[PDB]
Design a protein around this ligand. Structure first.
Ligand SMILES: Nc1ncnc2c1ncn2[C@@H]1O[C@H](COP(=O)(O)OP(=O)(O)O)[C@@H](O)[C@H]1O
Ligand SMILES: Nc1ncnc2c1ncn2[C@@H]1O[C@H](COP(=O)(O)OP(=O)(O)O)[C@@H](O)[C@H]1O
Ligand SMILES: [Mg+2]
Ligand SMILES: [Mg+2]
Ligand code: NA
Ligand code: NA
Ligand code: NA
Lengths: 464, 229, 464, 229
């Protein structure tokens, strides 16, 4: 009932609602399951079809000559209960109820009934009203969203359907590698706590991002207990929907609920070690940095820039996040004075001046990263005719390799189309790069915010 | 057991504890309260006042009177027998006028707490997160500016310390013009204990320690309300 | 002395410091002047060259047989005074001193002497220590930055050289149409006040964006008087460097000065009707919206969305900017109920649900914009397989055309690479589009912020 | 002209105005001040005290004593002729002992301001923006929390009104427990005048109206400091 191993790694999946019509939801899901490359058995379920997409079809899950782990259900809402009973008889462990038309439209009784019946068979429910789920390590795409994601270590959980399925697509554009996408929708049964327990134990998942509108009554304490322990090893980013009083009342009506307290949700996230993102862009920017970098081991952050202006944008942005730069170590200053002009600034940011050619980025970045008194590095670049963006980017890459260590690095590059390409090159190398200095600084800030959140939790778990 | 107070109130159909019952209750959890005595006669009131020592405070004790100041039921800083007897009858009548037939349990005699930095410690039940502790500076800082912090119970020392530092009026606790720093450890301790009260006692819907007066050494709960469910 | 008409629209420009060596700054500037298409006379100035890039060259400006309006001076700092004397002899009005090595490196005496000498000839100085300037209506690119910008109505002024020249390139990537780029660098003479006076009167400029580190002592009152008056007709966005205490101390040392008061600069920008941006991204996002839209005539802002989640993100972001949505007009609701399913939400945001096809975006957008009780529209789109991003975008374009009016519109689209193209398509049509719902809402919020800022100024100028 | 007060101070090499001179100066700009009289004898003091009305305040006036409280130079809430004569001689000695090398201009007789909501109105000169008006709530709100708003002078009504609404303690002006709303129009009016003082008088480097007491009708400047340059 509480172990989700067979949901994410099933041997057999039935798709209920697939048909000869390719426009049907069930049909789209079936298509994604096959194109993404699921290696287990897939059983299309359809009253009349003999075969769908080259697969033997059955009229009911109970007719399948096999143990079905998961049934993906997309039939009309007034047919769902029947399908649930059949799945129950057939011994199905997980009912992934795609179908909408439940509590979110006022039919609360139907939803409660759905869960009751599923539970009487020892079966758990995901949804209803969801777009499905994806698990990259099982080459399992049981959604009607995009057919593919970049492979990686980020798990994304979404209470929102349309925004969830769109963000599944946006991860590709933002170069975020995904281990899983889970649509939880109405959260009538399986919820965030259940999922965090699975992702805690999943070695494929290193970062968890959640779009969260609300938590069920009586579930919050357990949410804090689980999330806080997960946070000790894996960062959790929450995009809280309804994070203002106004928005909280708005989202209250969208799901048909009583409005949760903004202030208390915020304290719960603090006690859980969770980073709360106010926007998609912040959430994704932070998820990138957290996914591709270890947390800094101390507060010795260096900013390297070929322009004072970008450096001050960075300093102001770090400051907004409670991050204050201190004088670089003297050894680093000396190492850099070997090539830098007399009127470079070494206050931190280290300003290597606008005259800096590509190779100074290689040398500065390398010196910073090898220095034993440097914990983290943000590299800022402003495009000038003296440099090439791709050359600066390759210098940073080479430096990171030759330094050998893993210290957190973020990169901000400002300029034209050549910068856009250099930034894309870096992100495709899993070096967190952004097109403005403030975003690169906000991303680095997320690494420190997570280090501080983890410390909050460790302190709160101390034995007396 | 101090739980007998809760059971007793539930048995009598009351949905809150009287001030003396509430202070006794939180005291048993190790939260400092005013020394108190329930007087049933004007003679009891004078006699207890001597025992406790001057100056004292007299408050009406009635299931009916939830807001004692706003009905002339609170007499503060009484330094003599005459001031006490005046207060006794005065409250009897201030309350007889605005609250007739009220079942008076009596008049509470308690020491007049010297001036300090006033605090509020609250306990509520959030539908999601259950028992939640609330902290803020007293007076206008909570009442008017809503400058409050919350932690979901049970509280760790880290939770209590950080929620104190979080409120915007925090510097009122670390020394300012005409006021020494107060005992932060004592505040932390009371916050953790308030959380424990909420976790352990299901029948307590809500608790409000207001005012809580903080001193360079120790704190004292001057008024306490406990609502039952 | 105070009229900059001949700086931006000169008949004759001399470039001092150009040579047969293509890597010299002067040569880069000369190359840009020719490629961008300046139609007046260009006079390369060089001691020995008879010709540069096909143009008769002269050893001194004073030898040019013409009235030179502007001399772009790129020679070593120890030669600048001499070139200034010669420009003075020649009757030159503006000295654009590219050359660095003045007050920014401690040589304050040289900088003050520069200005003193220029003033003794009735000449003004831009800079020193700048990358030049561009004025699109005069096809004048006197910078060593990118050779081209998109034409439009945005004037960009930058006190930072590296960030300024980088942002000059970034305007292309962000589809921002430019009327002018002015590098002001050390601001020894001509400053933001002088420039604001010119852009106030320029019919080609509709929006002014300023990267500002600081204003000179004794210059702030005039800055407010001028800016407040410009703000009545043209929005001014300032990216303030040193907007935190920490950053203010930092930038104090970067320019060699005492730290300006953060709080008092904020009050001065409020009294000026200025929008202060905390980041490059915000500044550019707002600039786009302000450049391509009129200000809303009232508070009847409609958010149209095919998903509750994007809508709630939007509601929260508007709420953070003090913008609160109210119920749509009944007429609009009725118009939309003609095609929308029964369980669409009309609270504002208007949720036309995730099953909405491309055409509902055309119909909804058209209905909203044509409604006499709608003042502004933010359209949100989450990519689903039911739609195509480009079809939604073309629907939006069509609705805007057919509505005929100009009500402010911003668009937020979330999804994969096809959304990235559709967003790009919209911005190339000068429809302010963004890849997240919060950025589209923050952009719309800037239109309202400007309306309120202008109203602040109007109220503060009210007659007693 | 009130400028004679500034010119006199500069002529005698002084870099600030005495309390009575500062109140005269701002009063001439239409900013309400505590009614005052400069007494040169214990006898002048009783007569002025009756004119002004009881209760009164007596303060030592000397170029040397900048902090009158910190030398026993301030006597508050004097309700009788005798209390006045008592405060008079007592101040003469409180200061004669702690500062024997001190020039007395006299003793200021002053109206005792009843309690209200305290404010601060400041004027400073910013290097960029010149004369700038500062506003905040009195007491800990400016001193400890630094809750202040600024507007560059001259101030429009719009500037004055918005800068008042901007401060975090703004609600202390619109009515709270035990306190009626105060005269916002009078505050706006004083802020505007304060700005005018700064724009017009180049020799004034800095001005601090603190405390300023706001009432349901009108305000009163109780202490005023003006620094010259
Ligand atoms: N024992 C006490 N010592 C000091 N002050 C007290 C004491 N009891 C009450 N007060 C003061 O009197 C106020 C009113 O009394 P309180 O117990 O709060 O009754 P209520 O809130 O029902 O009117 C308190 O807020 C506090 O300022
Ligand atoms: N006329 C007055 N009415 C009411 N309170 C007064 C009066 N004069 C002084 N006070 C109070 O006494 C305090 C001390 O006097 P003040 O003018 O500030 O002198 P100083 O700061 O040099 O000691 C004031 O801050 C104010 O709170
Ligand atoms: Mg009370
Ligand atoms: Mg004083
Ligand atoms: Na520089
Ligand atoms: Na600079
Ligand atoms: Na409305």
């Amino acid at each position: 009932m509480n172990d989700l191993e067979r949901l994410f790694n099933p041997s057999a999946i039935a798709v209920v609602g697939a048909s000869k019509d390719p426009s049907k939801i069930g049909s789209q899901i079936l298509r994604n399951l096959l194109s993404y490359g699921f290696k287990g058995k897939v059983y299309p379920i359809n009253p009349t079809a003999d075969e769908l997409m080259g697969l033997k079809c059955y009229p009911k899950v109970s007719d399948v000559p096999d143990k079905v782990d998961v049934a993906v259900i997309s039939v009309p809402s007034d047919k769902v209960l029947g399908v649930i009973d059949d799945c129950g008889k057939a011994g199905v462990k997980f009912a992934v109820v795609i179908t909408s038309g439940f509590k979110e439209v006022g039919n609360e009784e139907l939803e409660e009934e759905l869960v009751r019946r599923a539970h009487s068979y020892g079966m758990r429910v995901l949804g209803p009203n969801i777009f499905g789920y994806l698990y990259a390590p099982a080459r399992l795409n049981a959604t009607f969203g995009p057919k593919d994601v970049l492979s990686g270590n980020v798990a994304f959980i979404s209470q929102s359907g349309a925004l969830g399925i769109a963000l599944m697509g946006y991860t590709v554009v933002e170069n975020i590698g995904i281990s899983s996408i889970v649509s939880v929708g109405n959260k009538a049964d399986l919820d965030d706590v259940d999922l965090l327990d699975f992702f805690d134990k999943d070695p494929n998942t290193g970062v968890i991002m959640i779009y969260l509108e609300g938590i069920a009554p009586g579930r919050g304490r357990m949410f804090i207990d689980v999330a806080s322990r997960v946070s000790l090893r894996k960062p959790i980013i929450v995009i809280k929907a309804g994070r203002t009083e106004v928005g909280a009342r708005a989202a209250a009506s969208h799901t048909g609920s009583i409005a949760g307290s903004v202030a208390i949700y915020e304290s719960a996230f603090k006690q859980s070690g969770i980073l709360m993102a106010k926007s998609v862009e912040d959430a994704f920017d932070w998820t990138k940095a957290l996914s591709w970098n270890p947390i800094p081991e101390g507060e010795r952050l260096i900013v390297l820039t070929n322009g004072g202006g970008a450096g001050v944008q960075s300093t102001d942005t770090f400051a907004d996040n409670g991050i204050y730069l201190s004088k670089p170590p003297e050894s680093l200053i000396q190492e850099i004075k070997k090539f830098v002009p007399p009127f470079a600034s070494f206050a931190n940011p280290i300003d290597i001046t606008g005259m800096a050619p590509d190779d100074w980025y290689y040398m500065g970045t390398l010196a910073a990263l090898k220095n034993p008194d440097v914990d983290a590095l943000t590299v800022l670049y402003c495009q000038t005719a003296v440099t090439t963006p791709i050359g600066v980017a390759k210098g940073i890459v080479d430096a990171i390799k030759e330094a050998g260590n893993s210290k957190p690095v973020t990169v901000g590059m400002v300029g034209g189309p050549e910068v856009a390409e250099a930034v894309s090159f870096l992100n495709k190398q899993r070096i967190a790069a952004y097109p403005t200095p403030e975003r690169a600084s906000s991303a680095m800030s997320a690494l420190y915010a997570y280090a501080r959140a983890r410390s909050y939790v460790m302190k709160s778990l101390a034995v007396r | 057991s101090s739980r007998d107070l809760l059971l007793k109130a539930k048995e009598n159909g009351r949905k809150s504890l009287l001030e003396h019952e509430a202070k006794y209750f939180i005291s048993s959890y190790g939260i400092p309260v005013t020394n108190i005595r329930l007087a049933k006669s004007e003679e009891e009131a004078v006699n207890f006042s001597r025992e406790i020592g001057f100056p004292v405070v007299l408050k009406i004790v009635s299931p009916q009177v939830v807001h004692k100041s706003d009905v002339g039921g609170v007499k503060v800083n009484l330094r003599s027998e005459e001031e006490v007897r005046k207060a006794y009858r005065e409250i009897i009548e201030n309350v007889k006028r605005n609250v007739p037939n009220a079942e008076i349990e009596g008049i509470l005699v308690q020491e007049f707490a010297p001036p300090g930095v006033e605090l509020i410690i609250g306990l509520l039940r959030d539908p999601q997160f259950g028992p939640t502790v609330m902290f803020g500076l007293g007076g206008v800082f909570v009442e008017l500016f809503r400058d409050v912090s919350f932690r979901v119970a049970p509280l760790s020392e880290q939770d209590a310390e950080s929620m104190i530092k979080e409120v915007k009026a925090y510097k009122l606790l670390t020394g300012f013009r005409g006021m020494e720093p107060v005992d932060i450890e004592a505040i932390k301790d009371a916050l953790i204990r308030a959380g424990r009260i909420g976790v352990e006692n299901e029948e307590i819907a809500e608790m409000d320690l207001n005012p809580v007066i903080a001193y360079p050494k120790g704190i004292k709960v001057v008024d306490a309300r406990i609502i039952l469910r």
